[PDB]
Amino acid sequence: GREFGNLTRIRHVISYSLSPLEQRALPHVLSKGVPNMLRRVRESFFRVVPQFVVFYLLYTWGTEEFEKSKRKNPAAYENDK
Amino acid sequence: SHTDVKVPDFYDYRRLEVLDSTKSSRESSEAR
Amino acid sequence: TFLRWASEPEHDHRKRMALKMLTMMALLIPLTYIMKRHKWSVLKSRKLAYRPPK
Amino acid sequence: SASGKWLDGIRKWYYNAAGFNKLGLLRDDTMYEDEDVKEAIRRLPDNLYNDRMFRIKRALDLNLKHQILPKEQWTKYEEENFYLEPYLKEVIRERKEREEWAKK
Amino acid sequence: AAVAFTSKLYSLLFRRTSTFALTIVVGVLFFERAFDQGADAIYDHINEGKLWKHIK
Amino acid sequence: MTRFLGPRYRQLVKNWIPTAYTWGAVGTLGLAWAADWRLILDWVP
Amino acid sequence: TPMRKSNPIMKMINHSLIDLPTPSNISMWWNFGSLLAFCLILQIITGLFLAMHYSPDTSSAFSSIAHITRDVNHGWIIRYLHANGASMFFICLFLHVGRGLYYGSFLLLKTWNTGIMLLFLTMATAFMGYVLPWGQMSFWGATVITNLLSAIPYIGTDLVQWIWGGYSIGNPTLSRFFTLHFILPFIITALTMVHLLFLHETGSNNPCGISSDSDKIPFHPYYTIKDILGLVLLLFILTTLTLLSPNLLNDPDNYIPADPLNTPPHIKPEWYFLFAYAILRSVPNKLGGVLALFLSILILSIIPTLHNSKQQSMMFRPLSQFLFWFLITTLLTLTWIGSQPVSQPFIFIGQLASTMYFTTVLILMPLTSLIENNLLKW
Amino acid sequence: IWGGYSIGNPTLSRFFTLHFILPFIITALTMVHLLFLHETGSNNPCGISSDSDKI
Numbered sequence: 001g002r003e004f005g006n007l008t009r010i011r012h013v014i015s016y017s018l019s020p021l022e023q024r025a026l027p028h029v030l031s032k033g034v035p036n037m038l039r040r041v042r043e044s045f046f047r048v049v050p051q052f053v054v055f056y057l058l059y060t061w062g063t064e065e066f067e068k069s070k071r072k073n074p075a076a077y078e079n080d081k
Numbered sequence: 082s083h084t085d086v087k088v089p090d091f092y093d094y095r096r097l098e099v100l101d102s103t104k105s106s107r108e109s110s111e112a113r
Numbered sequence: 114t115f116l117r118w119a120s121e122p123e124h125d126h127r128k129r130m131a132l133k134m135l136t137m138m139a140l141l142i143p144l145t146y147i148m149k150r151h152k153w154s155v156l157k158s159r160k161l162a163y164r165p166p167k
Numbered sequence: 168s169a170s171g172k173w174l175d176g177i178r179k180w181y182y183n184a185a186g187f188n189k190l191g192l193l194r195d196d197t198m199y200e201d202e203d204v205k206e207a208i209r210r211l212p213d214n215l216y217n218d219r220m221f222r223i224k225r226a227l228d229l230n231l232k233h234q235i236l237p238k239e240q241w242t243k244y245e246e247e248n249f250y251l252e253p254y255l256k257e258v259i260r261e262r263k264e265r266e267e268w269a270k271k
Numbered sequence: 272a273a274v275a276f277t278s279k280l281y282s283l284l285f286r287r288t289s290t291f292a293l294t295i296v297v298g299v300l301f302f303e304r305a306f307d308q309g310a311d312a313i314y315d316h317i318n319e320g321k322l323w324k325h326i327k
Numbered sequence: 328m329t330r331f332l333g334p335r336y337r338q339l340v341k342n343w344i345p346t347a348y349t350w351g352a353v354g355t356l357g358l359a360w361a362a363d364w365r366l367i368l369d370w371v372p
Numbered sequence: 373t374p375m376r377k378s379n380p381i382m383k384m385i386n387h388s389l390i391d392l393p394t395p396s397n398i399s400m401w402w403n404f405g406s407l408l409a410f411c412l413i414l415q416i417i418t419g420l421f422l423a424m425h426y427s428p429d430t431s432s433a434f435s436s437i438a439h440i441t442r443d444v445n446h447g448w449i450i451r452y453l454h455a456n457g458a459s460m461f462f463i464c465l466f467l468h469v470g471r472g473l474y475y476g477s478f479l480l481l482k483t484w485n486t487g488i489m490l491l492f493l494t495m496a497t498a499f500m501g502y503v504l505p506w507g508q509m510s511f512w513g514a515t516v517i518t519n520l521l522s523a524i525p526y527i528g529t530d531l532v533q534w535i536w537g538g539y540s541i542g543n544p545t546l547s548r549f550f551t552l553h554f555i556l557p558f559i560i561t562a563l564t565m566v567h568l569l570f571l572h573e574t575g576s577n578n579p580c581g582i583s584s585d586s587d588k589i590p591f592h593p594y595y596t597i598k599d600i601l602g603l604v605l606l607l608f609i610l611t612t613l614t615l616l617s618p619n620l621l622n623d624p625d626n627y628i629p630a631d632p633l634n635t636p637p638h639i640k641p642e643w644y645f646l647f648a649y650a651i652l653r654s655v656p657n658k659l660g661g662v663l664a665l666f667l668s669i670l671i672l673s674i675i676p677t678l679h680n681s682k683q684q685s686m687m688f689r690p691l692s693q694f695l696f697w698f699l700i701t702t703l704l705t706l707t708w709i710g711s712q713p714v715s716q717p718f719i720f721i722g723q724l725a726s727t728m729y730f731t732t733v734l735i736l737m738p739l740t741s742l743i744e745n746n747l748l749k750w
Numbered sequence: 751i752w753g754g755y756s757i758g759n760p761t762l763s764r765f766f767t768l769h770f771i772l773p774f775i776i777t778a779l780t781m782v783h784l785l786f787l788h789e790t791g792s793n794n795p796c797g798i799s800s801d802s803d804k805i
């Protein structure tokens with residue numbers, strides 16, 4: 001079936017490659033890779049983060065409320081006698 | 082036709098172990 | 114302290130053994146990463162061109 | 168009326184947010200190849216077919232290299248070409264006609 | 272020209288697959304012992320006074 | 328779908344109704360016979 | 373020809389993982405299937421060993437595990453490995469599902485359906501292993517899960533009593549749990565092979581959602597070394613969890629043996645289940661609760677049917693992405709609610725989270741897809 | 751293999767685990783067996799080629 005002899009039909013594309021032993025494995029990290037990671041974080045920040053911030057607010061609120069609910073109310077004894 | 086062919090330059094990627102050229106080719110190969 | 118020991122005798126030997134095999138598994142990460150980078154450099158530096166007769 | 172300029176404004180915003188232009192790609196490049204789309208691609212003339220194939224390979228190479236084109240080379244919203252739409256409309260008409268025959 | 276270390280290493284040991292394999296078994300024999308001894312030393316040293324080997 | 332609304336499909340369904348309720352009878356009686364379902368089998372003489 | 377292609381067994385291996393054409397551009401999210409397989413293998417091995425020391429009897433189960441962890445040489449670490457491997461297994465499983473939801477790989481229908489089957493099987497297996505120690509939590513977990521079939525209106529109670537083998541949970545039920553827990557993993561293995569058979573007829577989808585037949589590379593050497601790297605990382609994490617912090621996920625209430633007369637005041641299942649538990653807790657009706665419990669997972673089967681977009685992947689679809697991450701946070705919320713007592717704030721929050729989960733899958737995503745289509749002018 | 755100085759309780763559980771697992775290995779190998787068979791087809795009583803009279 002699917003085999004490297006007849007996958008698709010292409011015309012007029014040229015490629016060039018070096019061998020691994022001719023070139024470096026980690027050529028430019030701090031001059032190219034770091035800024036690229038930075039933009040890659042920039043492009044997705046506001047699509048992911050705010051939902052989790054909202055989750056954090058909800059969690060803390062619900063915890064606080066549950067913990068208030070367990071403390072004794074002075075009006076339950078002071079009001080009528 | 083083809084005769085206009087030329088591989089683009091790869092200078093950024095190549096190892097310094099061949100750029101510091103004071104050693105025969107095949108001995109370099111061996112070191113790498 | 115005695116109840117701690119009664120609940121978990123493997124304590125000391127466990128920590129002893131952690132030092133070793135964690136050192137090893139930590140060492141193996143960068144080595145295999147280097148091997149990966151070596152095999153993938155062929156594609157990472159590849160250059161294309163389009164030359165139709167036009 | 169103004170409503171046209173307003174709708175076109177939001178449409179341009181959505182287009183820049185999508186970001187396939189950063190890879191050098193046209194909108195019609197990004198369709199999923201269902202049955203009708205494959206038949207429309209079969210009908211293209213050679214020049215359009217070859218241009219499409221190279222554009223797509225180039226985007227794939229960039230994605231491999233976690234990179235994008237220079238800003239100067241991004242596809243602009245005001246000068247794009249919907250080269251595949253016409254053929255697709257014809258394919259869909261033909262299928263609709265056959266369906267409608269099949270219920271009589 | 273320049274008899275360099277990694278080139279000697281390639282030509283003597285790594286060029287032939289059998290000898291590469293032999294090199295590997297020989298290296299592991301000695302690595303194992305050195306590595307064990309170092310680790311045990313460190314461990315013993317972190318908690319002197321608390322192990323029954325010495326309290327004995 | 329919206330495709331299968333039309334005359335041919337109505338005719339085609341009518342063609343297969345009887346076979347459908349016959350297979351229904353087969354399945355129902357078989358289930359009952361297999362699980363000794365008294366709710367149905369107590370009415371069999 | 374090379375021997376690589378001389379013979380059916382060898383040629384199937386070759387078409388599977390030597391000369392298979394893979395996309396050049398797939399990312400780390402595609403490593404988690406191989407890690408799943410690794411985890412299955414680890415579980416089977418460590419289980420076959422444990423099996424030879426465990427006792428499927430209610431008067432010695434607990435003490436057999438004590439024996440394993442105290443007297444068997446390095447038995448404690450084998451126990452630790454089994455228990456932590458299950459956790460890793462589910463981590464990988466969840467991430468594996470999520471990928472496919474994001475990148476539109478559910479359009480491979482056969483692979484997707486066999487995946488749903490596998491999810492169900494793995495969950496059954498994990499639960500039937502969780503009751504074998506016969507601690508205080510194990511017992512009541514068994515009880516609840518086997519009472520679930522009482523909700524079937526006409527035949528339910530009889531089903532419960534036929535699974536118990538008696539008037540109540542007891543010795544005859546534990547051997548059933550153990551036989552089933554023994555046999556299921558191998559059915560999982562076979563179905564995994566079918567799963568991959570189905571996959572290799574089309575090949576892998578990729579992040580861009582467009583056809584990759586112009587840039588296919590062979591599986592070997594590229595993805596071989598890539599997956600080996602992934603495995604090394606998984607082993608580092610697993611070792612640190614096993615040796616440096618073994619009690620991180622552990623539950624004290626399962627170190628008390630079973631007592632049929634007392635349920636403990638605070639009830640909590642294993643973490644990978646909490647969310648279902650929350651869903652089950654949220655409906656004030658028995659039958660409705662169980663129905664929701666099962667629909668929560670069965671709903672994945674109609675995602676392919678509700679797909680309206682012209683594009684396959686969310687990579688180029690921002691509104692879609694926003695909704696995706698909101699859904700993930702709803703699931704986190706259900707997990708958190710599952711940990712808390714059944715008290716009023718958490719009751720109300722859980723009900724909202726459940727309604728929003730189903731709402732989002734069934735309504736909001738389809739409609740955002742239509743809006744998106746209109747914004748691109750098709 | 752005994753797990754001790756003699757035949758005893760630790761050996762019986764080993765017998766039982768192995769007896770549980772082997773039949774399924776047998777099943778898988780049976781499938782391989784038939785896979786191998788169907789590449790050639792069945793021999794017959796006469797020992798001569800039957801490709802002129804296959805049903």
Ligand SMILES: CCCCCCCCCCCCCCCCCC(=O)OC[C@H](COP(=O)([O-])OCC(O)COP(=O)([O-])OC[C@@H](COC(=O)CCCCCCCCCCCCCCCCC)OC(=O)CCCCCCCCCCCCCCCCC)OC(=O)CCCCCCCCCCCCCCCCC
Nearest residue numbers: 037040041044045048049053399400401609612613616617
């Ligand atoms: C005592 C225990 C000790 C434990 C020690 C543990 C040590 C672990 C060491 C691990 C080392 C791993 C090395 C891997 C090398 C692999 C190389 C490779 O090829 O990688 C490719 C892979 C990416 O693959 P890809 O092909 O790009 O595809 C991915 C996407 O498709 C690409 O899509 P994209 O391009 O769109 O994405 C861009 C961007 C997307 O960005 C975003 O989405 C935005 C993010 C914004 C974040 C902002 C900050 C946070 C939020 C703040 C918001 C504001 C709050 C305001 C609040 C207000 C309140 C009022 O994403 C990134 O760039 C992500 C990069 C970082 C990845 C981090 C991975 C973490 C792993 C953690 C493991 C934990 C378990 C350890 C074991 C524990 C045992 C107990 O990863 C990388 O490229 C990064 C490699 C480096 C990772 C280093 C991770 C170190 C973690 C250390 C943890 C130590 C603490 C543990 C705590 C435990 C607690 C229990």
Ligand SMILES: CCCCCCCCCCCCCCCCCC(=O)OC[C@H](COP(=O)([O-])OCC[N+](C)(C)C)OC(=O)CCCCCCCCCCCCCCCCC
Nearest residue numbers: 349350351352353354355356357358359360361362363364
């Ligand atoms: C879930 C549990 C409960 C399930 C209960 C099942 C209920 C339904 C049972 C139906 C039984 C009869 C079906 C006959 C169908 C024949 C179709 C066919 O092709 O026939 C012609 C074929 C071929 O015949 P032929 O080729 O000579 O000619 C046929 C041509 N025509 C039709 C024109 C005449 O005959 C067969 O070879 C059919 C063999 C069928 C064997 C069935 C064995 C019984 C299995 C079910 C009973 C046991 C249930 C146990 C439950 C226990 C619960 C605790």
Ligand SMILES: CCCCCCCC/C=C/CCCCCCCC(=O)OC[C@H](COP(=O)(O)OCCN)OC(=O)CCCCCCC/C=C/CCCCCCCC
Nearest residue numbers: 287288289290291292293296373374375376377378379382
């Ligand atoms: C006594 C102590 C133990 C001693 C152990 C000694 C052995 C050590 C390990 C040796 C590993 C094997 C290395 C050599 C393998 C050679 C394989 C070979 O020649 O076959 C290659 C060739 C490749 O096929 P094509 O692609 O068609 O080739 C066409 C080329 N144009 O043939 C094949 O297909 C592969 C055949 C593999 C045969 C492997 C034989 C293995 C023998 C192992 C013996 C172990 C004995 C252990 C004894 C223990 C004590 C009782």
Ligand SMILES: CCCCCCCC/C=C/CCCCCCCC(=O)OC[C@H](COP(=O)(O)OCCN)OC(=O)CCCCCCC/C=C/CCCCCCCC
Nearest residue numbers: 044048401463466467469470471473474579686687700703
């Ligand atoms: C022991 C306790 C365990 C608790 C549970 C653990 C599992 C759940 C973990 C939840 C948090 C996961 C965070 C993962 C990192 C997210 C990084 C991120 O936002 O990056 C966005 C970045 C954007 O890239 P692109 O759109 O492709 O374009 C870039 C190329 N130009 O990457 C992505 O969006 C890829 C998203 C892939 C899917 C991720 C799925 C994560 C959650 C999955 C599990 C959730 C539960 C199960 C869900 C399904 C239930 C039916």
Ligand code: HEM
Nearest residue numbers: 402405406408409472477483484487488490491564576577
């Ligand atoms: C034991 C459980 C499972 C195992 C061992 C397993 C194994 C695998 C493997 C090895 C792959 C290869 C590609 C990859 O790693 O991404 C894969 C792909 C896939 N799996 Fe599974 N899987 C399991 C469960 C699931 C589940 C639960 C689902 C969905 C609900 C699923 C759906 C898919 C899909 C759709 C693909 C192909 C998607 C693509 O290539 O884009 N699988 N699986």
Ligand code: HEM
Nearest residue numbers: 415416419420422423426455458498501502504505554557
């Ligand atoms: C997908 C594969 C498997 C999963 C997810 C799984 C899961 C589990 C879990 C969660 C436990 C309880 C852990 C604990 O109590 O700390 C367990 C226990 C057990 N499992 Fe596995 N298991 C798998 C495969 C197997 C296999 C193939 C066997 C074969 C005999 C096996 C034998 C056992 C035994 C004997 C126990 C009880 C021992 C103990 O609790 O430590 N398991 N399993």
Ligand SMILES: O=C1C(=C2CCC(c3ccc(Cl)cc3)CC2)C(O)=C(O)c2ccccc21
Nearest residue numbers: 388389394402405406409410568576595599
């Ligand atoms: O990891 C695989 C993979 C497979 C590799 C070999 C694995 C494996 C697991 C266990 C054993 Cl004993 C042997 C091989 C199973 C998964 C497979 O079939 C794919 O098609 C695929 C596609 C893209 C990315 C990764 C993969």
Ligand SMILES: O=C1C(O)=C([C@H]2CC[C@H](c3ccc(Cl)cc3)CC2)C(=O)c2ccccc21
Nearest residue numbers: 495509512513516517639640641645648649
């Ligand atoms: O009350 C419960 C309870 O409700 C469950 C539940 C959790 C969800 C399970 C579940 C069933 C089916 C699926 Cl598809 C997923 C999870 C069933 C058991 C437990 O696991 C449990 C464990 C120990 C003590 C009490 C309990």
Ligand SMILES: [Zn+2]
Nearest residue numbers: 126127130446
């Ligand atoms: Zn040890």
